[PDB]
Amino acid sequence: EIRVHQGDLPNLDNYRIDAVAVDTETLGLQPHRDRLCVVQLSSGDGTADVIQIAKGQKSAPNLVRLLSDRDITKIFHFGRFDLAILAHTFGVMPDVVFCTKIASKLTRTYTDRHGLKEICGELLNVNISSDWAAETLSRAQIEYAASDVLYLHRLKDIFEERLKREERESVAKACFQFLPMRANLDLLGWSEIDIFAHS
Template identity: 30%
Template sequence: MKIHELITTTEPLRELCERLAKSEFVCVDTEFMRENTYWPELCLIQIGNEEEAAAVDPLADGIDLAPLWELMCDNEDVLKVFHAGGQDVEIVFNFTGKTPHPIFDTQIAMMAISQSEQIGYANLVESWLNKTIDKGARFTDWSRRPLTDRQIEYAIGDVTYLATIFPKILNKLIKTGRGAWLNAEMDKLADPANYENDGDLAWRRIRSPGRNPTVLGRLKALAAWRESEAQHKNIPRGRIVRDETLADIASHPPKKQSDLAKVRGLSQAWRDNEIGKRLLKVLEKAEPLPKEEMPEKAKRGAPLGKEGALVADLLKLLLKIRAREIDIAARLLTRADEMEALAAGVRDLPILEGWRYEVFGKDALELVEGKLAFAVKNGKLTMTHVDDMAEELAERQAAE
């Protein structure tokens, strides 16, 4: 594989992207800093295929990243491969208003062919290539210039290894016939709605204090205000006000600014500073949340009770058995709250649709309906249909 030196000007970047545009896939990774800013600061972009790879310096004077964004977001013929790519996709969206497409995430893919829930990149490389990555450069200051040779080598390695691993993962997905299982997960990763910073929707990320429209209306107004303040100052939203403090203020709004000093999570300065004044004005203008914006109630059946809780526990045990049997991450199949809903009588669930129904949901439903039971065979815990158990018992009795 040809490894290019750090690209710092537009023309070499354009030439690289023209060559990569002829590939079936490109692997992409980024290095960024976001500890002290609202917007992640893009410091380095690594991109490559099986033949060549390079690191691109987005902080270089005069460099135009347009050829890269065109390849990433407008070229539908080239698959963009990431590992745990959520934050990388967010960065692309912040620059372009678009997300890379089509897209493939090897961390998500590993869930379909192994029991790995969130395998890290170093473990991925070790398991597929039997190589150990030097993590020493991982936590360096990527915004400082010049970058060291060690930093560049480490960064480019993130895509060179991935370019070797991806075809292996793809082949295994094809052999197991599980590629279609990942379509919805990849579409979710590429959905621009996940990365939009819409202040009016920011409240949905905060744990809602109940379902009171007045309280939620205040929370919506406060969350939108906090986003605006954080964006304007370009600092993390939590440095303005933490989530739990915002929810507390929405539930128990102060009557006057001096009361802000009594709120847990706010300093004494809030009693008379300008940001405190702005917060009070937001509270004064807040209106109850409209009915059409109220969060949907969680799908619930009858209260579980002791018997229902026991059934839910049995479903979780079944999930562990099935995940082990077919070598898949349990999280890709279902979640604990979904199994509790199934035990409570809810039937409108993803677990009872499509491939999840065939792989797990059908047996889960039969377990709830008493048609399936646990059995120990050859020292292993397995699932057996009740009718089959009855037949086996009858045969044994007849033989005796």
């Protein structure tokens, strides 16, 4: 089941959960040039909500309420980007987050391939652009967009098990705590700079 909406959620039903999987689609990698076009959400129950964002849209009160609720962990893959584009679009930076890309880099030390496809293949044996600004999204587009959020909860559970096993929970927690500010630094103009590097 994939529910497609225009502009905002109708309500926050099905989203009283403790953690929500979140992803975005845009016109590109540069938030100042490339607008947010689609937002995907999942409660982890095997269904997803796909929300089409209009050009110039500045507000999405129910969605933004969800994004701002500190009692709900937002799960991303490479949240550095999604946090940046979400904050740029709606003016709210989430501050309770989990990133599967950071978790992979902290746990899957036996590989250099940390993409979502490879992670899903290794951990779950699950097999995972286009004009996202189109007025009407195709069925293939909607199914692809939903596929990016359907599995993030299971990955979070496995990565939390691995982080506990290798005793890296506080490292991951500190990285996730800093991640929203890393995204803010990207938005402010340091996107090409490792702020902690010697040069």
